[PDB]
């Protein structure tokens, strides 16, 4: 094996033991605010159709 990058301190210590070497954009606020309002529109439309059905 191989132990490397051994760092010690009062709290403890760390290291890395190697056994074998290797064989060898996020959407904008506008686009988010757009989809959130698109979903609210589809709700309002579905609700309007119900209130239209009840009016009949």
């Amino acid at each position: 094996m191989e132990v490397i990058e051994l760092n010690k301190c009062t709290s403890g210590q760390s290291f890395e033991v190697i056994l074998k070497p290797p064989s060898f954009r996020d959407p904008s606020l506008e686009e988010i605010q757009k989809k959130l309002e698109a979903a609210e529109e589809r709700r309002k439309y579905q609700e309007a159709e119900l209130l239209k059905h009840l009016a009949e």
Binding site: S11, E16, S23, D26, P27
Partner: protein, 437 residues
């Protein structure tokens, strides 16, 4: 010292958060009233524990956390709990009616009403940081808030904190404690929308935690309190490197560097040992080799799966207690010759080890017994994809008949998002496939 802000969403996230901060105070020696006698620098701090706690002129150490829930009942218990004096009112955000286990209701309908408030409250803690590293987001997959509202928050956070890192602690749904039939829907919906916004996510399957409590703790019918106290231990050892002096996983960026070579494959498997029942009259304290060997037993993993039939991309060993590097390498040597541990060709076969001398802390009067040494392994193994296949199969069974889909469309969602999310999970399973074979 760079600060870390914790965000707890939904019942699971809030209750798990309450268990973790209780454990943090016990470990750091912070009393329920926010006082910390061992802290000599009053009102100001550049220490490792200050990455999770701020300080007031009066000497209170306030968690850098924000609780959010679309229902007040769960967060009300924190407002009147043992650590009420710990948090200030601005940190606890609650609505009136929850998401009713509906992803669309928590993401679109109700989420849109409170998203700006939460971000503003988060900005309150961000402005009080000198060098914010990022966020730790606790939530469930099945809950309507934990799944729906978390994906919306993860989106906005990437817009307001594009440079910061974001880590997840996600509760994978298990029917033995499940509360809704559509939890597979919510799990896949929230994973699709959050995948590109999470740098490193630690999944915890309630099934695994449930069985661990039954076998190793002798609890006939474990409760959320039993599960969370055990989950907090795993979370504590994972975040211990951020709260104490050390050299491994010193900042959130290091988690992605050590465990996530591929962005999409950012779901490391966590194994913990030993889990000893405090009821046992006497138990023989396990050695370094015994607890290290237990890290390769599936019965101790946070997600039941067989790493033998997969390949590793990175492994980290986190020891808490009486452990010296010499004993670790000796245990690793014997384990290599008696276990199947295959790494990917382009990755070196090795272990990043970290040792903190303070033994693990257990809630007085809890279920876990105090041990002299414990370990938590964080292995990025393709075997964890078994959990994705399970979810995706249940998803396919229900979606083929469109069962329960109307509840989501009625909240503003479109069936197209169902297929998109499923296709994304289908791609995720293939990524594990090729990397794993």
């Amino acid at each position: 010292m760079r600060e870390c802000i914790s965000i707890h969403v939904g019942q699971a996230g809030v209750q798990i958060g309450n268990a973790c901060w209780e454990l943090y105070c016990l470990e750091h020696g912070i009393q329920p009233d926010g006082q910390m006698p061992s802290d000599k620098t009053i009102g100001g701090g550049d220490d490792s524990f200050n990455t999770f706690f701020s300080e007031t002129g009066a000497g209170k150490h306030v968690p850098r956390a924000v609780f959010v829930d679309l229902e007040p009942t769960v967060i009300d218990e924190v407002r009147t709990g043992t650590y009420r004096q710990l948090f200030h009112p601005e940190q606890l955000i609650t609505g009136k009616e929850d998401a009713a286990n509906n992803y669309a209701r928590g993401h679109y309908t109700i989420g849109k009403e409170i998203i700006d408030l939460v971000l503003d409250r988060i900005r309150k803690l961000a402005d009080q940081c000198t060098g914010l590293q990022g966020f730790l987001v606790f939530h469930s997959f099945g809950g309507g808030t934990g799944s729906g509202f978390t994906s919306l928050l993860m989106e906005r956070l990437s817009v307001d904190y594009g440079k910061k890192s974001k880590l997840e602690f996600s509760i994978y749904p298990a029917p033995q404690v499940s509360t809704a039939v559509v939890e597979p829907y919510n799990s896949i919906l929230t994973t699709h929308t959050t995948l590109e916004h999470s740098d490193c996510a630690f999944m915890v399957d309630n099934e695994a935690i449930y069985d661990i409590c039954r076998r190793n703790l002798d609890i006939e019918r474990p409760t959320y309190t039993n599960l969370n106290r055990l989950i907090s231990q795993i979370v504590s050892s994972i975040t211990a490197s951020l709260r104490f002096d050390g050299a491994l996983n010193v900042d959130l960026t290091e988690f992605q560097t050590n465990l996530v070579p591929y962005p999409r494959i950012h779901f490391p498997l966590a194994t913990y040992a030993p889990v000893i029942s405090a009821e046992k009259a006497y138990h023989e304290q396990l050695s370094v080799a015994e607890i290290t060997n237990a890290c390769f037993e599936p019965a101790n993993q946070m997600v039941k799966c067989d790493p033998r039939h997969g390949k590793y991309m990175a492994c980290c060993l986190l020891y808490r207690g009486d452990v010296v590097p010499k004993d670790v390498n000796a245990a690793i040597a014997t384990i290599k010759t008696k276990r199947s541990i295959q790494f990917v060709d382009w990755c070196p076969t090795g272990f990043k080890v970290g040792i903190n001398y303070q033994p693990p802390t257990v809630v007085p009067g809890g279920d876990l017994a105090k041990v002299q040494r414990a370990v938590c392994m964080l292995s990025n193994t393709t075997a964890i994809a078994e959990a994705w296949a399970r979810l995706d199969h249940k998803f396919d069974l229900m979606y083929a008949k469109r069962a329960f889909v109307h509840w989501y469309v009625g909240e503003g969602m479109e069936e197209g998002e169902f297929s998109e999310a499923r296709e994304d999970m289908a791609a995720l399973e293939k990524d594990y496939e090729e990397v794993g074979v």
